[PDB]
Ligand binder design. Structure first.
Ligand SMILES: *[C@@H]1O[C@H](CO)[C@@H](O[C@@H]2O[C@H](CO)[C@@H](O)[C@H](O)[C@H]2NC(C)=O)[C@H](O)[C@H]1NC(C)=O
Ligand SMILES: *[C@@H]1O[C@H](CO)[C@@H](O[C@@H]2O[C@H](CO)[C@@H](O)[C@H](O)[C@H]2NC(C)=O)[C@H](O)[C@H]1NC(C)=O
Ligand SMILES: *[C@@H]1O[C@H](CO)[C@@H](O[C@@H]2O[C@H](CO)[C@@H](O)[C@H](O)[C@H]2NC(C)=O)[C@H](O)[C@H]1NC(C)=O
Ligand SMILES: CC(=O)N[C@H]1[C@H]([C@H](O)[C@H](O)CO)O[C@@](O)(C(=O)O)C[C@@H]1O
Ligand SMILES: CC(=O)N[C@H]1[C@H]([C@H](O)[C@H](O)CO)O[C@@](O)(C(=O)O)C[C@@H]1O
Ligand SMILES: CC(=O)N[C@H]1[C@H]([C@H](O)[C@H](O)CO)O[C@@](O)(C(=O)O)C[C@@H]1O
Ligand SMILES: *[C@@H]1O[C@H](CO)[C@@H](O)[C@H](O)[C@H]1NC(C)=O
Ligand SMILES: *[C@@H]1O[C@H](CO)[C@@H](O)[C@H](O)[C@H]1NC(C)=O
Ligand SMILES: *[C@@H]1O[C@H](CO)[C@@H](O)[C@H](O)[C@H]1NC(C)=O
Ligand SMILES: *[C@@H]1O[C@H](CO)[C@@H](O)[C@H](O)[C@H]1NC(C)=O
Ligand SMILES: *[C@@H]1O[C@H](CO)[C@@H](O)[C@H](O)[C@H]1NC(C)=O
Ligand SMILES: *[C@@H]1O[C@H](CO)[C@@H](O)[C@H](O)[C@H]1NC(C)=O
Ligand SMILES: *[C@@H]1O[C@H](CO)[C@@H](O)[C@H](O)[C@H]1NC(C)=O
Ligand SMILES: *[C@@H]1O[C@H](CO)[C@@H](O)[C@H](O)[C@H]1NC(C)=O
Ligand SMILES: *[C@@H]1O[C@H](CO)[C@@H](O)[C@H](O)[C@H]1NC(C)=O
Ligand SMILES: *[C@@H]1O[C@H](CO)[C@@H](O)[C@H](O)[C@H]1NC(C)=O
Ligand SMILES: *[C@@H]1O[C@H](CO)[C@@H](O)[C@H](O)[C@H]1NC(C)=O
Ligand SMILES: *[C@@H]1O[C@H](CO)[C@@H](O)[C@H](O)[C@H]1NC(C)=O
Ligand SMILES: *[C@@H]1O[C@H](CO)[C@@H](O)[C@H](O)[C@H]1NC(C)=O
Ligand SMILES: *[C@@H]1O[C@H](CO)[C@@H](O)[C@H](O)[C@H]1NC(C)=O
Ligand SMILES: *[C@@H]1O[C@H](CO)[C@@H](O)[C@H](O)[C@H]1NC(C)=O
Ligand SMILES: *[C@@H]1O[C@H](CO)[C@@H](O)[C@H](O)[C@H]1NC(C)=O
Ligand SMILES: *[C@@H]1O[C@H](CO)[C@@H](O)[C@H](O)[C@H]1NC(C)=O
Ligand SMILES: *[C@@H]1O[C@H](CO)[C@@H](O)[C@H](O)[C@H]1NC(C)=O
Ligand SMILES: *[C@@H]1O[C@H](CO)[C@@H](O)[C@H](O)[C@H]1NC(C)=O
Ligand SMILES: *[C@@H]1O[C@H](CO)[C@@H](O)[C@H](O)[C@H]1NC(C)=O
Ligand SMILES: *[C@@H]1O[C@H](CO)[C@@H](O)[C@H](O)[C@H]1NC(C)=O
Lengths: 491, 491, 491
């Protein structure tokens, strides 16, 4: 009562959160934040990326000109979205290395088509069919020109088209495989058939194959689709003695941030940077567990479903410096205006006051970590395919291995980051507590002794103004030293 | 002698181990554990994975039905093991994209075969040869049907088989390349030859090639092998005007954890989760240096041959807090019952006692690290090939680049992990020493002074019970304070 | 004046450097070092790697024997350098899977050619042309043998060459595609044409294709190039009924550290381990931002343009322990002979002296980090291509994805490394300051008090020798204790 008590302490909360550290699988901190995005809003937002809903059409079909896809002529996109309900409703076709054509078009991001006046003298043009109905009338692929005999003849062709432009030209064309020699003759006069299209730096030579294939919408014949790119100064040369499905011009081909994604998520009227096939996801967090397939500024895909980053000190209700959860027995739930503070007992009563500077010092360091982690995601656009409908073997093994390797390495980085950061956050908060204790100890000089539990026995009368002077660093120890020394060193 | 001495200290061992840290390439700790598995027991354990020793046969040969491999019919496996002594002893064949077929079968993990009744009217069946001897009699691939002319004719074929099942069908078939036009005629009547097998979504068209190839076991002709997968609702259509080696049915194809590995390690009767081509390896450690090729729950392959994780404090025989290898000059080899402790000298003699709580605190943190690192390996099954017998160029460059990239990134993670963990382990053990010293200092209050080497000069008579009271935290400093103050502050 | 003052402190500089840490985006340290190499000297040094400047020739052209490339016969290289000004000046040719052939030759690293005596009876040899002029005379590819009819006939060929050597043989050959049936007849008698070259383990069957292609230097015909590798015990068998461009022997094929790089950097007379297409770069730093394409012992490519590693303490002009930028208000710019030191004031004046041991302790730890980071780069030779002139789709997507994945993971490692190291460097330097303060405090025992700003009020007369005794650890506190106690505990 000719003394006072001044206790240093830290807050605590009733609702702590369990986090992982380097040394401990489960340690409770006052607060934490989730680093793995685990949910989607279920819609693909139409902003800020130019979305193109394929709806009933695949990219290839819109490219070829299946009547169902006429509304897609000359469209551009940042992301083309293919629905699984999609289906082709024209002449049956295949594409050798389909995936590569789909990819290069997707990545180009435009269906811009220019018509070119090819010299088809000696042949019938605009071939038409019952399996490809447009406006209730028999039609064909809008971008392709089906050549047939004219007056029962079909001469050799040797037509050229030069690229005298400042850009690349993308040609799409194909070969017809009739189901019967009857049809071969009926359509092309001759029995055989041969197609050869060349440039200065390439040649693709195709030999038709008459034969039966299982009928698709009642058609047993097939078209095989091919592409060739012609650069400025180069020339397209197309030779044919049969079966040639002719281009009507070229597609502009670009390089940019365009791509394509398989999804059945509906398009919504909203704005979100990151798109997955499950829908758009917020990109505030650095990691996500929604889908390895993403487009835009996205958190990185990891295996974990949750990773909590501590944003507060260890919670001790009721560190390397040994203050928090050490010589200070527990935290103060009644301290809600700061993280660290003072409790005192003197002649005028018992009080509690937060220390702002130590509180702010810890908060700033924690916000420093958050600043490095939150809202810093990176943009990816066209990548590789990561889900597959058919067995292909080698190349598919490689593609899957690459993505699995990547994911394990990112999942490792995420796990280690959080464990290291959390160990460090618990240590820095213990350190700020220790610094406050140490600073106060030095202030008191010979006027007080450390009771070993964060409390100082102050060996002189110390009213509220006196305690206040200690808390704001204006305590003059010389004023009380004589009083304190006599109380300390007596019998 | 009207005083006592109490010294704080830590153990040390005669046999220290050198580890790496962030700041030091070679620092000695009391104990460490090896994180890189560097040895195999030389055998592939037959448990707990279903092992299939190919012995004399490659997977493809067991698939085709080389008489040598009859015992393999309809077998399943988790891991198929190909021996290098393996060799084919039937009709000479090649497979275009051999590696992809080998892969998809390996990954499927079953040789389950169902026979199908194909309508081969107009042809001779069960063709047979001298290069493929079964039961001492001329035979052929058990799963293939060699068609030849019947009565010197060989009509067009147009046979269908539909998939009306709930699963995929895998068809294996092939084309015969006779060495002479003589043989072409002798076998198939006609001079030419043509094979076309189709589904609703595919077509593979093959044209035979008569010609001589260097004789393998005296045969200059060859079979080329092909495969096609037919899904539910789809149909196989096979057209042929020559040279068709016919399937006798389909293989069930599955998806699972199956794979294949090249090794000459004998199969042992033992249980081990992780298999390498050198033999099975323990998977307690997180890393391994045995082989980049693995199967099962395996440590990750890294380049280092050794990485030691400190599991004890710095060894100081004869840190950031400056206690261990700092103001405490050395450790105590005579302390074998704890890591940290007390030595005293008083009127009753000199003694040493371990402090359990500080010892346990360091041990728990170290076990926390071990828990994150030991026995936590991850399962990989079918991957990519990582050793190659032939030059292939581009794709092989990519496969090698991917694995080399992966390995360097894991080797980096391993190196950094151990350096960080070791720096931290040395620091946390120094910290526990410091906390014990600090706690003891506070206990003694004004009754003792810090001599600067971890020892306290206690300024009062302190018998064994008194020293004991300090060690178990029951020391009442008020009892001795008058005695201590008078001894401290005299002349 | 019956007292002295002894202040503990650390240096500071006028020219600090901003670095990143875990908790702070911008913190000033006394010194830092750059970890990202951002510049090239613009030349490719001809040492210590054997450089081969392709100059006007591509690797393939030197391989085939384009007259322009005669000087390259049988050359070896560590790194072949292709110039963009390069051009072919012989018979127009293409290579299917050009990139794979270029790669395997590059990786082999030799143009060693042995001539082989093939039995070409029944044919004319040494075919020659106007598009391939050597010594002012019509010539051909030096390594190829253009076969034509002899006396208007051209029999079937069935020539063998066996590998009875201890090494692999690499055969290069090709097929001629005449522009007219006229030329086909003129050159090869027959109308058709067929080439089939085989080994015991392979067969490549080619069918020529008569037709027009856009003329390259006035030639509309083309040669297609192929390769086959024959191992010891195996045999080359080449059948042909037309159009065969024959090999004149084989290339030795090796395995080693050879590769190829596209660059327009001039070759310089200098020595540098690391080569990029921009020129050689120093490899002292662990990372580089110059080019993802490298050869030799190179720093790793990362995205950042700069990463500064702190090599000094926090700069405080005018940490977890709270000494530097904590209870010590600022550093001393006037201390240029050490990092930590003593300032005193006594009867004889005011002085400053560096403490070497604490200075050396921090410097050693920092050099420990530098030793792990500086001059430890790793050797890579032949890798994958990373820049592309044509759209290819799938495989190119995979190659680009792999490199982009790798780069992001290394850029992550670099960013985290520096942030962790810097946080730790700032903390260890604060720790050394704290240890020095703590050690000094203990030395002084009851003779001094901590004023709270790193300074001790020493309560006795302490001349220069006395202060000196404190700095070199020979201070005997017992000598002054009576004097000090009386001054401390008075009124
Ligand atoms: C080969 O066989 C298939 C199936 O038996 C034939 O295709 C069928 O043709 C009939 C008309 O005769 C159609 O009604 C069926 O719908 C077809 N089935 C399928 C699965 O496409 C085919 O015509 C035969 N080939 C030849 C040349 O006759
Ligand atoms: C092409 O040449 C090869 C090798 O000279 C011939 O193959 C040989 O045929 C004889 C029989 O006449 C066998 O005894 C040899 O063992 C064969 N050698 C090899 C390497 O296979 C082949 O017959 C020739 N082609 C033709 C059509 O006669
Ligand atoms: C196919 O057309 C091309 C271009 O019209 C022809 O190639 C030209 O041939 C003339 C000679 O008649 C040359 O002067 C031109 O330089 C050639 N142009 C190109 C682009 O190569 C080609 O001859 C035609 N095919 C046939 C069989 O006549
Ligand atoms: C290009 C062309 O004119 N094709 C005609 C075809 C062909 O005769 C068959 O595809 C060959 O059997 O027959 C019809 C049809 O199928 O709709 C009308 C169409 O005009
Ligand atoms: C399918 C078939 O019946 N093949 C017969 C062959 C062929 O005549 C040759 O392969 C062509 O020269 O000759 C024999 C043989 O080689 O064992 C017996 C066998 O019956
Ligand atoms: C192998 C050979 O002898 N080729 C001859 C060719 C061919 O007649 C044409 O390439 C076919 O039109 O014509 C010439 C030439 O072009 O230089 C001379 C040369 O001797
Ligand atoms: C703890 O409770 C408070 C008050 O209800 C709340 O604001 C805070 O978010 C809670 N913390 C956690 C981690 O849920
Ligand atoms: C928990 O931490 C996060 C991140 O700093 C913050 O947004 C949230 O407000 C905190 N919760 C409380 C109750 O302070
Ligand atoms: C898509 O096709 C379905 C039939 O499969 C049809 O009902 C629907 O109206 C089509 N949608 C559009 C936009 O054409
Ligand atoms: C074919 O149809 C297109 C438009 O559908 C037309 O521009 C073109 O002139 C037609 N060709 C012929 C030969 O009539
Ligand atoms: C393929 O089979 C059908 C039925 O005979 C028919 O297209 C034809 O006969 C066969 N192909 C050839 C090239 O003869
Ligand atoms: C996203 O879709 C995948 C299937 O493509 C599914 O496995 C995953 O659970 C989905 N995620 C969410 C959050 O719905
Ligand atoms: C320090 O506390 C005393 C006591 O209440 C007060 O009078 C004084 O204004 C404070 N000083 C500062 C700088 O706030
Ligand atoms: C040190 O020696 C003891 C006793 O022989 C032994 O148990 C221990 O394993 C040794 N430590 C090392 C790292 O070898
Ligand atoms: C060394 O550490 C390992 C891991 O904690 C432990 O298994 C072993 O018993 C330790 N050795 C000694 C001698 O304590
Ligand atoms: C495997 O083949 C060798 C001959 O190459 C033979 O000696 C051995 O008995 C065969 N093993 C089996 C299991 O058939
Ligand atoms: C061919 O042999 C199999 C069994 O080896 C038999 O089931 C089949 O009936 C035979 N075919 C003919 C046409 O005899
Ligand atoms: C290939 O060479 C041999 C020997 O003459 C024979 O098979 C045939 O004559 C050649 N091929 C063709 C298609 O003529
Ligand atoms: C495992 O096999 C590889 C060769 O495939 C060899 O380089 C390596 O040394 C072997 N490891 C052991 C531990 O035997
Ligand atoms: C503390 O030590 C004293 C002295 O030996 C002993 O009597 C007492 O039982 C100890 N207290 C505890 C709680 O063990
Ligand atoms: C600071 O200045 C000194 C003297 O000019 C110089 O040697 C040193 O390199 C400078 N530090 C930096 C980081 O530029
Ligand atoms: C800065 O640090 C680097 C690396 O230790 C060193 O080379 C350089 O001399 C230092 N600069 C000064 C001025 O000490
Ligand atoms: C390379 O070709 C150019 C013409 O394109 C020529 O001027 C130059 O002399 C050539 N250089 C060599 C080394 O042949
Ligand atoms: C073809 O030319 C080469 C050298 O240019 C010569 O060795 C060879 O004998 C010639 N061939 C003939 C058939 O003259
Ligand atoms: C290709 O076109 C040109 C011009 O007629 C010529 O080479 C030939 O007629 C065509 N090809 C065939 C195989 O007829
Ligand atoms: C190196 O070359 C690349 C283009 O290949 C260029 O983007 C980069 O800026 C160059 N780097 C330097 C340091 O010149
Ligand atoms: C310590 O300092 C004193 C005072 O100058 C000096 O006489 C003595 O030689 C020093 N001791 C050592 C070991 O350098």
């Amino acid at each position: 009562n000719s003394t006072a008590t001044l206790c240093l302490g830290h807050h605590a909360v009733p609702n702590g959160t369990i986090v992982k550290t380097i040394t401990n699988d489960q340690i409770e901190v006052t607060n934490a934040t989730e680093l793995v995005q685990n949910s989607s809003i279920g819609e693909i937002c139409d902003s800020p990326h130019q979305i193109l809903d394929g709806e009933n059409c695949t990219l290839i079909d819109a490219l070829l000109g299946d009547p169902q896809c006429d509304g897609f002529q000359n469209k551009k996109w940042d992301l083309f979205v293919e629905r699984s309900k999609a289906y082709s409703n024209c002449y049956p076709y295949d594409v050798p290395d389909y995936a590569s054509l789909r990819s290069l078009v997707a990545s180009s991001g435009t269906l811009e088509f220019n018509n070119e006046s090819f010299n088809w003298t000696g042949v019938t043009q605009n071939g038409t069919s019952s399996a490809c109905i447009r406006r209730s009338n028999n039609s064909f692929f809008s971008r392709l020109n089906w050549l047939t005999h004219l007056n029962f003849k079909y001469p050799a062709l040797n037509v050229t088209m030069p690229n005298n432009e400042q850009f690349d030209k993308l040609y799409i064309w194909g070969v017809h495989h009739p189901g019967t020699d009857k049809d071969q003759i009926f359509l092309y006069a001759q029995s055989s058939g041969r197609i050869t299209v060349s440039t200065k730096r390439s040649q693709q030579a195709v030999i038709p194959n008459i034969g039966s294939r299982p009928r698709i919408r009642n058609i047993p014949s097939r078209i095989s689709i091919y592409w060739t790119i012609v650069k400025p100064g180069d020339i397209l040369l197309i030779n044919s003695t049969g079966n040639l499905i002719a281009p009507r011009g070229y597609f502009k081909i670009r390089s940019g941030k365009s791509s394509i994604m398989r999804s059945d998520a509906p398009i919504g009227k909203c704005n979100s940077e990151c798109i997955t096939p499950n829908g758009s996801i917020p990109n505030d967090k650095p990691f996500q567990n929604v889908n390895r397939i993403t487009y835009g500024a996205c958190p990185r895909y990891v295996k974990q479903s949750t990773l909590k980053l501590a944003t507060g000190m260890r919670n001790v209700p009721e560190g390397i410096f040994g203050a928090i959860a050490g010589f200070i027995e527990n935290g103060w739930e009644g301290m809600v205006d700061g993280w660290y503070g003072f409790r005192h007992q003197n002649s005028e009563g018992r009080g509690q006051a937060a220390d702002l500077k130590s509180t702010q010092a810890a908060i700033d360091q924690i916000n420093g970590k958050l600043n490095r982690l939150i809202g810093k995601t990176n943009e990816k656009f066209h990548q590789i395919e990561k889900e597959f409908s058919e067995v292909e073997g080698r190349i598919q093994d490689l593609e899957k291995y690459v993505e699995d390797t990547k994911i394990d390495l990112w999942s490792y980085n995420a796990e280690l980051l959080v464990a290291l950061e959390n160990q460090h956050t618990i240590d820095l908060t213990d350190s700020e507590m220790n610094k406050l204790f140490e600073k106060t100890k030095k202030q008191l000089r010979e006027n007080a002794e450390d009771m070993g539990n964060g409390c100082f026995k102050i060996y002189h009368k110390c009213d509220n103004a006196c305690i206040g002077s200690i808390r704001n660093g204006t305590y003059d120890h010389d004023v009380y030293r004589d009083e304190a020394l006599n109380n300390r060193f007596q019998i």
